[PDB]
């Protein structure tokens, strides 16, 4: 934020103290020239990743071997890259020497430009142009920038709704031209990129091009991508765009699992989905659901209840909360344990969370001798 480019001017400023070259690049020169305050600020330099160790007390070594160390220093990280191009496989990083070689294959000319320590920029594919403009534009052969890492076509998409661009007419037809090559991305690079997508401004805009560019042809069953987005307003949690567009296609969790949802995630999604299936909820409902599910599933269907009052006066919030467990049924009905006792637990969990049946062990126990018996 306000310490983020900084404390990048002081790590160039001790790159090249040391002889090295060191630039800001790619999208914090982006942002700066669009009045933004940088997420991320990235340096490249010509220092390898063991000098860049011996200059600074604090690294973090994760990215070494892709050309990146991150910097630790007046509470910020700054991830600083020595000049590089990388490609990917169907299934590889060469360190340069030059800025430019490393600008050139960058994936769009915006995020293609560096700044110096005296704020000049190196603009050599015509980002600043592209940024005054509101155009995408690949670097040099789209084709090529594409064939590169095809997740940059899905990428071109997620900044056109990010910053309000449009895409680059030859960028757009190559990615249709290239668009079967998504196949060999790992669906959690899919995934990142849409979710952020689901959560970022001018969405509908974003999701038209994935149609328009032909990669909802490819993704995985990219098909269910293609819903009316209209109704669709962001709650912040990315979550809220699966579940919007299983919602309005009447579909089940199981169509979009191939994108490798976190056990926490699904569970969020599918019991928001059986909660728009739900006729009526009444203080069960709300006892046995969560509050983050109960308000999906009311965002998704267009209700504006009070959830959290509701769940806030019911009688008890848990099971934890219950005055009898299985050993109290075991006692009173002289019968082994065995799974009638979670059948009888219920019972009496729904007489007390309806408010009907008081959660006092005595009571509960009178209760019980005269159902049983």
């Given at each position: ?24 690049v ?8 669009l ?13 390898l990743?063991?000098q ?14 892709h ?104 960028t ?31 969405m ?22 293609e ?45 928001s ?24 599933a ?14 806030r ?21 002289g ?27 005595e009571?509960?126990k ?8």
């Open positions: 934020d306000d310490d983020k480019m900084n404390t990048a001017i002081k790590v160039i400023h001790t790159l090249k103290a040391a002889g090295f070259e060191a630039y800001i790619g999208g914090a020169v982006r942002d700066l020239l009045g933004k305050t940088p997420h991320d600020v990235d340096v490249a330099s010509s220092a990743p063991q860049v160790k011996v200059l600074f007390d604090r690294t973090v070594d994760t990215g070494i071997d050309g990146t160390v991150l910097v630790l220093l007046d509470g910020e990280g700054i991830e600083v890259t020595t000049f590089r191009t990388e490609s990917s496989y169907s299934d590889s990083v060469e360190f340069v020497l030059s800025l430019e070689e490393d600008l050139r294959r960058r994936d769009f000319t915006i995020n293609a430009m560096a700044m110096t320590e005296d704020l000049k920029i190196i603009d050599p594919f015509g980002g600043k142009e592209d940024l005054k403009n509101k155009v995408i534009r690949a670097v040099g052969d789209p084709d090529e920038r594409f064939e590169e890492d095809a997740l940059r076509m899905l990428r071109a998409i997620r900044f056109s709704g990010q910053l309000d661009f449009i895409i680059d007419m030859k757009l037809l190559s990615i249709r031209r290239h668009a079967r090559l998504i196949r060999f991305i790992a669906v959690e690079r899919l995934k990142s990129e849409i979710d952020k997508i689901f959560v970022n401004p001018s509908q805009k974003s999701m038209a091009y994935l149609k328009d560019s032909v990669l909802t042809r490819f993704l995985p069953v990219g098909g269910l991508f819903v009316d987005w209209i109704t669709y307003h962001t709650d912040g949690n990315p979550t809220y765009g699966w579940l919007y567009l299983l919602h309005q296609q009447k579909r089940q969790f199981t169509d979009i699992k191939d994108y490798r949802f976190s056990n926490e995630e699904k569970r969020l999604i599918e019991k989905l059986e909660l728009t299936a739900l006729n009526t909820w009444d203080q069960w409902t709300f006892y046995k659901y969560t509050l983050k599910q109960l308000e999906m009311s965002r998704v269907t267009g209700k504006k209840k009070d959830l959290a009052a509701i769940k006066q019911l009688p008890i919030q848990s099971r934890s909360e219950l005055a009898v467990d299985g050993w109290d049924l075991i006692e009173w009905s019968a082994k344990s065995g799974p009638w006792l979670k059948v009888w637990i219920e019972k009496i969990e729904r007489l007390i969370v309806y408010g009907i049946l008081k959660n006092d062990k009571l509960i009178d209760w019980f001798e005269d159902e049983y018996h």
